[PDB]
Design a binder for this molecule. Structure first.
Ligand SMILES: O=C(c1ccccc1)c1ccc(O)c(O)c1O
Ligand SMILES: O=C(c1ccccc1)c1ccc(O)c(O)c1O
Ligand SMILES: [Ca+2]
Lengths: 241, 241
């Protein structure tokens, strides 16, 4: 029953992870937007000393979000939050019960975090070459069950971990968002439409189809607009190699 | 009844993380060293096609390590492995039971993976400036309970995640091992001996005192020797500004 507050921002795929898990848990919770990149509020370091989004407070007295309680637990780091939601809500089966299937879920999150997320970040925010990101996405795709399903078979927090970023990639490419070259945008677009990535396309579609996504997504159009506010997304700038 | 094989390498802190958890778990297991950085066996991509240490097999018929079975579960990524071992040995209490303390464990691992490991890498492999690593260590020291204890109070896999790296840092610094200058090496040794870092020195002592560390650590001088065999550590080489 203890309260849950998630501090969030529409553009943020990390915050999006946790909204999805909270929907899949059926949790009662409060979200509060934080302009973390343009105008961080002065109280925000009390909920997260690291000054990143998402931030979560857990239990303590019901306060307004801009009036955080010292008595609430402050949880940082979106993957830690997903595991926490799974622990709080075992009835929701947000992880398998079998230890091998659970390791499948954990390995998928690790593969994404360690080899994929850094490429999305560099390609989009630094304009680094696209080929290593497509390699890493082919690798991640190879970890999926071949005949359909989610990362560990049944949906789990592994899929909440990963869909926010894969679901952003297609519309951002179509909107031309990112500091990569024209040449790599075409390459990525043709690639993500090619037979080689059909499996990851089916996985995006399957995850997007769940209420947890539809209820945490502003719409492709609106998410593009939100991304367009990110300072690092310096419009009119591209890098070439 | 299910067999565990860990493919290992003495120099590897990621392999070392999983050895420590297995010792804490009371597990029955086999380790098999792989010269991954210099002469990888060709069967190796059969247990981990990412070609990385550690690798793990679980179950299947008991075969010699160098003849893996296509029937064993192949588990990759050391943090996935730590969670797997905690799932396999719940009577060993490798994580807390309380959800908030579990979240402490998960957050500390994410902080190290997300903000510290990349800095060690930068400083030791590219000899970049030492100061952002010291800040990130102070951040991580800040997450520990100030008056004593491990990351989550009781010992947990979060400690297995982190001590392989911290425990290596001190002897490598004594050895000049790494691409950083003498000057940054001095600054780092002085810093890690100053009162600023008393708490993280305590944590390393407390982790190193447990048998799980003793039984998985070849000795300070031996671990240094193994580290010299790592090409990217480029022994006798140093960068200056
Ligand atoms: O928004 C994105 C993003 C998401 C999908 C594709 C490209 C970029 C993003 C990706 C990594 C990050 O580390 C990060 O902070 C970010 O905002
Ligand atoms: O071995 C080390 C290392 C250990 C202690 C201090 C400095 C570096 C290490 C650190 C990051 C890595 O990504 C990695 O592969 C590594 O081997
Ligand atoms: Ca496969």
């Amino acid at each position: 029953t203890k309260q849950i507050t998630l501090y969030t921002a529409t553009f943020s795929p990390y915050a999006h992870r946790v909204r999805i898990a909270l929907e899949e848990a059926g949790a009662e919770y409060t979200t509060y937007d934080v302009d973390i990149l343009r105008n961080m509020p002065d109280w925000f370091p009390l909920v997260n000393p690291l000054k990143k989004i998402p931030a979560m407070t857990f239990g303590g007295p019901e306060v307004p979000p801009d009036q955080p309680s010292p008595e609430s637990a402050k949880i940082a780091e979106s993957l830690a939050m997903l595991e926490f939601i799974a622990d709080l809500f075992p009835d929701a089966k947000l992880l398998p019960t079998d230890p091998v299937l659970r390791a499948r879920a954990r390995t998928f999150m690790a593969l994404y975090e360690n080899y994929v997320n850094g490429q999305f970040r560099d390609v989009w925010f630094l304009g680094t070459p696209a080929d290593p990101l497509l390699q890493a996405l082919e690798m991640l795709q190879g970890a999926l069950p071949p005949d359909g399903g989610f990362a560990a078979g049944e949906w789990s927090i592994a899929d909440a971990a990963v869909i926010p970023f894969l679901a952003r990639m297609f519309p951002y490419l179509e909107a031309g968002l990112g500091l990569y070259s024209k040449e790599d945008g075409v390459k990525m677009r043709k690639a993500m439409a090619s037979e080689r990535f059909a499996r990851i396309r089916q996985y995006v579609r399957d995850c997007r189809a769940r209420p947890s996504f539809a209820n945490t997504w502003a719409g492709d159009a609106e998410q593009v607009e939100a991304a367009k506010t990110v300072p690092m997304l310096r419009v009119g700038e591209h890098h070439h190699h």
